[PDB]
Amino acid sequence: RLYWDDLKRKLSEKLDSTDFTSTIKLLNENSYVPREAGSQKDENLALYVENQFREFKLSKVWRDQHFVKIQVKDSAQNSVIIVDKNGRLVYLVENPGGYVAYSKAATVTGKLVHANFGTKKDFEDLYTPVNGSIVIVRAGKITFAEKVANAESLNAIGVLIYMDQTKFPIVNAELSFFGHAHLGTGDPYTPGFPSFNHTQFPPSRSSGLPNIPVQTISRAAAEKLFGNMEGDCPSDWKTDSTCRMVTSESKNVKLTVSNVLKEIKILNIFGVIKGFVEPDHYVVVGAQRDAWGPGAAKSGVGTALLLKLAQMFSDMVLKDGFQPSRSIIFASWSAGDFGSVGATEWLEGYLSSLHLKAFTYINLDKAVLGTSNFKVSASPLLYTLIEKTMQNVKHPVTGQFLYQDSNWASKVEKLTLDNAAFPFLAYSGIPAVSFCFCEDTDYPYLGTTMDTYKELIERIPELNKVARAAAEVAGQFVIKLTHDVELNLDYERYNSQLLSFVRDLNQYRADIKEMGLSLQWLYSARGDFFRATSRLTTDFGNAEKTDRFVMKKLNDRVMRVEYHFLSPYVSPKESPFRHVFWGSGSHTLPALLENLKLRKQNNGAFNETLFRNQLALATWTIQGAANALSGDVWDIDNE
Amino acid sequence: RLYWDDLKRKLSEKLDSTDFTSTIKLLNENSYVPREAGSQKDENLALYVENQFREFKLSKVWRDQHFVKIQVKDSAQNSVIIVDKNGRLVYLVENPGGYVAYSKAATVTGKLVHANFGTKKDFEDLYTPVNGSIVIVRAGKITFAEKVANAESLNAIGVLIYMDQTKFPIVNAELSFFGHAHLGTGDPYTPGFPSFNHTQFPPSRSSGLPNIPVQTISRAAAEKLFGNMEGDCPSDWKTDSTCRMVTSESKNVKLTVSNVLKEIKILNIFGVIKGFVEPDHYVVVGAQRDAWGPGAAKSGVGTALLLKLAQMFSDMVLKDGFQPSRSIIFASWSAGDFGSVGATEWLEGYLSSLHLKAFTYINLDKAVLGTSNFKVSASPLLYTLIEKTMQNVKHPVTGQFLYQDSNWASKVEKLTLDNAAFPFLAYSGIPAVSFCFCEDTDYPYLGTTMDTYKELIERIPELNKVARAAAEVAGQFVIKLTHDVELNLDYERYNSQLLSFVRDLNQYRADIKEMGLSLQWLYSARGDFFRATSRLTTDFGNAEKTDRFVMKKLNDRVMRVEYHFLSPYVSPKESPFRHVFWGSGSHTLPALLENLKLRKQNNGAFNETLFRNQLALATWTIQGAANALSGDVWDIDNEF
Amino acid sequence: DEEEIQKAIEELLRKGVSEEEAAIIIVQRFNVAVVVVVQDERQAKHISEYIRRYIPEADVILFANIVVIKVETHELRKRVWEAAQKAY
Amino acid sequence: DEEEIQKAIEELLRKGVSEEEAAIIIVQRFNVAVVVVVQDERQAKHISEYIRRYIPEADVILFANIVVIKVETHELRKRVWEAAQKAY
Ligand SMILES: *[C@@H]1O[C@H](CO)[C@@H](O[C@@H]2O[C@H](CO)[C@@H](O[C@@H]3O[C@H](CO)[C@@H](O)[C@H](O[C@H]4O[C@H](CO)[C@@H](O)[C@H](O)[C@@H]4O)[C@@H]3O)[C@H](O)[C@H]2NC(C)=O)[C@H](O)[C@H]1NC(C)=O
Ligand SMILES: *[C@@H]1O[C@H](CO)[C@@H](O[C@@H]2O[C@H](CO)[C@@H](O[C@@H]3O[C@H](CO)[C@@H](O)[C@H](O)[C@@H]3O)[C@H](O)[C@H]2NC(C)=O)[C@H](O)[C@H]1NC(C)=O
Ligand SMILES: *[C@@H]1O[C@H](CO)[C@@H](O[C@@H]2O[C@H](CO)[C@@H](O[C@@H]3O[C@H](CO)[C@@H](O)[C@H](O)[C@@H]3O)[C@H](O)[C@H]2NC(C)=O)[C@H](O)[C@H]1NC(C)=O
Ligand SMILES: *[C@@H]1O[C@H](CO)[C@@H](O[C@@H]2O[C@H](CO)[C@@H](O)[C@H](O)[C@H]2NC(C)=O)[C@H](O)[C@H]1NC(C)=O
Ligand SMILES: *[C@@H]1O[C@H](CO)[C@@H](O)[C@H](O)[C@H]1NC(C)=O
Ligand SMILES: [Ca+2]
Ligand SMILES: [Ca+2]
């Protein structure tokens, strides 16, 4: 048979004989660019991936057809206009070629105030308030949707987004770019339920849709604006010297956005390698396919890694005697630029059919951006697998192993809204992982017309060797999760996450004591969960690995670990990101901390009646997951 | 091994040698009566059931401690007073000995209007409106909570409940009784989450709590009121001749309720017989233990059946070689007179640990009330098991088999709010069964001080043979669900339920086409679910019955059948009865029909934008359950 | 008890509570069946005379223009209420 | 194109749209850089001479007391706006 070392070599052997740069080159040909979601060239690349999966001889290939509402530019030009001296002096700043999807169609006019990146901290550290005025913000740090939401939260009437040259060293100052301002994922006009014909598309509007117009402008347009603005941008921001803060007294900005909705047909292409022991369980490997521009780095690299991962793994099963216990699903989503729409509609549609069957999602999107750092954002259940992978996968340039920081897990950042792996983890309770070889600065040409293969190979000369290591990381992920009778998911990694939450909450024990409350039951839950994980490791130790009945009895308890952290007390339709650790909403553990921090200030920003309910449900959500992991219901303690 | 015919006989022999009337007599002794929830006598009976479970030598015995808020009488007397001629004439009607738990503490004064049983139809078919007036209603037909909720919806300021002699043939006309008016289940001050100390009891109020005072009065008090009321009660109602409709011009009724809350400790007592093959799955058998009065018929019979069912099955495992594959849990809840609090807090507390492990709940509450009829309310998944049981279980009196109506399943009514098996099915997605030997009239002494053993054996002389057949029915339920490699759950029974929904919905095809909608995708979902059940039956046919893996692979799909009907789009905290078939709320299939029923009438009661969302989410809930039952996700072919 | 009622009704009227309100307070504080509020003191005895003649099982105590009636059986209590409405 | 612009400017003012509003409509309908709203014809001549003198690369067409300016480079567009602000 084949052990891990035999499979690691057979994977590493086929990686050296794989040409990745020629595949990325094919996906960037004239027939597949540009491929905005629902376009004809999007359907062309979908049909190519569909045929490629059949030639690889997978177990089965199928497709889903969704009809989602997106937003596109109108025949009427969007404009940014400066008006001076009571509307008697007008100045055309830019007729942008880009736009922000899901912006509100409106024309707002008033003061323009700079707010750095638009984060909540940036709006707090501002001299001028943004009440009733238009806001201009630099791209980065947070998603377009978060910028708009934070400006809306302070009653701003509009948002402008540009790319300064300090953070985005781009020679073309007239370059336009694209984004979306929906504070969520999926089709925002079918929130919480799939975009199938069965629903007959009832009137439903996501609460994440903004209610102010937002427009993107080039750096030249932003420098046109700064010539009409006063105040020096602080040195903390580390931006261009042409930066300014607030328009003059008699000067205003007239933002005109007139985007329109468009019902489009999107295609999700799938391929599956059926398992040999437990085929009803499976891992999912996905990669975004659509892009506003050419999307070589955003979409081309991801799809290329997906195509060759399916070819290599299908070759190993048929030609090298690979026998995975669980199945493997390869997926090429569409409508990813609008906010993981193709992937979210799949989860929202087949949630019942993959409740406790899909146990890991791997996202190959934007896996190659640079060569300096190897960053990863994932669920703690995959931290141990990621650590083991970094210890025997060599850097393309350095040649040393990826594992160089022993405190790497304490520095990991959580998955963000723009990541296609976020809805898998925060909504469906499926452990997810996103990884990339990148630099400390953002890939500047993302979301622009310059995200071509020419610009990608010029910045990364070793693109083939770098794309090979990205496949080796994702390849080792799939093998470790599918070949052995034991799942490489590490449930013990949540003991540090829970202990960090209880310790962080204990720093405000003074506020808790004066409200007549106690953290003693939250400590009890952390300890009850710790002992449940220690008992499960003991049960796995004394387990006869060949006894399939006892093993899947224990494996079914592991695949429930991530699910039992979804909040059982919230509506998945109006609050779909239910994961108390990584989701969004008042039910999350970070939301509990932000509220309690507001009590030491005498103002009534604190709610108390909400906090007491937050502490109650969060305490039992942890205690409930602990009691389910301990074993049977009759094996629980009482005080 | 032991086959079914060997187990059916081994159970039937121990049933004949079991004394049920002596246990019901013991539970009605002076040491365990009365046992209001949280009382000392309630805790005494808990230790008896706990010690009896240890003497039966079960696998494990344990108990849970909850701290729930109930409502009890105040030191201030509740009063019903008639005031005439501008407060210058006062008339004491009654200082009632009963009360309605969770009624609002208030003093209301105004007109009194009769509303028959208080159902929604009764308030619609009324000449006088009840806005700003007190309402008096007969007990029965619907729960106390439904009566109060329907009156509040029409701006009533108070509710009086009495027992007429036609529906309740009681000789004592001054008898008071007890109930609760909470439109829900569980501790109404911890809605959606368990009543444990861990929660630290945050300020939360269930939306089912009423905001009007509710009081129970005796028949003599009601006849005192009718002497100040005009109008003849319709002959349709079939009530007493002393009945009247509306008070005189200058007369008002002053209802004064001042009940207070009380935090109490309740006990849930448990015992388990562990399985031999798949012990992580189990059936649950429960029975309410507390009662306001003696509760012989309400609580005594149920707990007595629970005690002897645990003794017989434990005897069968140790002395007769019974080896059930799955486990059996015996539970004795408390605070049952309130909103099924003891059982609901258990579900709300350990929901994660019994997500796909507990696959059936059997409710023994009020299983003996009469002897004429044998009634059953249950989930369709257990219809086949119930039908198979009725074909080899003899009636206590007639000696004939219980299976006498071949079209019995079309006449079954769904579980009601007052039934302890309702939250198991409508909230946790666990198939449930409630059954009873009863008569066409309600047991009159339920919720009164006359629910004694003496009145129960006097009305039911063959109580031992009746309680034996009730135990035989529940016994055969447990055996069929635990001994064979098949769960005996019939998933095909939902094909008739879906077909009935489509037929009822086809009646409004004119309205559907007129709003630009189509029933074609709901047609596809009904057929896709039928094909999913046929594929699973085929898989069970070709299954190697000795192959333990393929059987539990197929059984895991069966245990998800009931769960996949809980609405995935509703908040379990603010609307816990999520089951689209048997729950409550706008997400249920009847709610879709009730709304669409308001469109054919020109009135603006219809809410289009709500219906379009109802039809959308209900369509996919059915299609999703079909796609999950078909098998793997890649093996779901449809005409999408 | 007649002394206690007559003195407790005296305090309610001295404290400033109206006769109509004091009538309801007596019924929920004492074991009283019917209370009638009359205009003059002549009517107070007339109503008491009428009720003692036709329902002699009743104890009728009066203070100022408020007359208190104590009876125990459902039927007799009914007859007292009907007598007070007739003579009011 | 000057013929097309001046004819579109004729309709907006006849329809009743304000000069300030018509200025914004012109910039969003044609490839014009800066538009100035003037009082009398003297300033319209003052502004037109001043901008042609310092920026002769610009084509300036005017109708009534509204002056339209078409230039193409970011740098020249900058100078036109600064010239129009100075001479206003
Ligand atoms: C979990 O929550 C429940 C409900 O809040 C809580 O139960 C309550 O605990 C308190 C504290 O033990 C109980 O109050 C005591 O009851 C006993 C029994 O009669 C009394 O002897 C106590 O009196 C002492 O304390 C008084 C404080 O003023 C003194 O005045 C007195 O002289 C005595 O020193 C006290 O009344 C309360 O009865 C229960 N509730 C119920 C319904 O029984 C429970 O303690 C919580 N558990 C934990 C671990 O926190
Ligand atoms: C599932 O839903 C989608 C969305 O409604 C359906 O697609 C739509 O189908 C209609 C009718 O075939 C199309 O109408 C046509 O529109 C074109 C627009 O140019 C018009 O010229 C034609 O005269 C006709 O009116 C509509 O365009 C189309 N929408 C999209 C985005 O493709 C689809 O048919 C539904 N599928 C099923 C099986 O019901
Ligand atoms: C602090 O947070 C709590 C939430 O925990 C806020 O309570 C909320 O208050 C509003 C307004 O009173 C409630 O809205 C109500 O909805 C019901 C639904 O039927 C409706 O009947 C009422 O008329 C009202 O519109 C809301 O439900 C309630 N939420 C909860 C969970 O109770 C509270 O307002 C916050 N305090 C501050 C100062 O913001
Ligand atoms: C008809 O039903 C819709 C759907 O429930 C109601 O719309 C809701 O209105 C409330 C209050 O504005 C919102 O909080 C909900 O989000 C709305 N739901 C949707 C789906 O829009 C509407 O109010 C109902 N109309 C009437 C007259 O009852
Ligand atoms: C009940 O409603 C009717 C209709 O408006 C009104 O005339 C009447 O005064 C109301 N009665 C009360 C007691 O509110
Ligand atoms: Ca959707
Ligand atoms: Ca509760």
Numbering used by the authors:
A (entry chain A): 121 to 759
B (entry chain B): 121 to 760
C (entry chain C), D (entry chain D): 1 to 88
List passages from the publication reporting this PDB structure.
We sought to use our protocol to design a human transferrin receptor (hTfR) binding protein. hTfR transports transferrin (the major carrier of iron in the body) across the blood–brain barrier (BBB) via receptor mediated transcytosis, and this process has been exploited to deliver therapeutic payloads into the brain parenchyma that would otherwise be blocked by the BBB. We developed a computational design approach for designing binding proteins with beta sheets geometrically poised to pair with exposed beta strands in target proteins of interest. We targeted the region surrounding an edge strand located in the hTfR apical domain.
However, for strategy 2, one design (designated 2DS25) clearly bound fluorescently labeled hTfR. In the 2DS25 design model, two helices on either side of the central beta sheet extension make contacts with TfR across the interface. To probe the sequence determinants of folding and binding, and to facilitate determination of the structure of the 2DS25–hTfR complex, we created a site saturation mutagenesis (SSM) library in which each position on 2DS25 was substituted with all other 20 amino acids one at a time and screened for hTfR binding using fluorescence-activated cell sorting. The key interface residues were also conserved, while affinity-increasing substitutions were identified around the interface. Combination of these enriched substitutions yielded higher affinity variants. The crystal structures of two increased affinity variants (2DS25.1 and 2DS25.5) in complex with hTfR were determined to be resolutions of 3.1 and 2.8 Å, respectively. The structures are virtually identical with an rmsd of 0.26 Å. The structure of 2DS25 superimposes closely on the computational model with an rmsd of 1.2 Å; this is notable as the fold is more complex than that of previous computationally designed binders. The structural differences in the receptor are at both the backbone and side chain level, in particular at Tyr211; a superposition of all hTfR apo and holo structures in the PDB shows this region is flexible and can exist in multiple conformations.
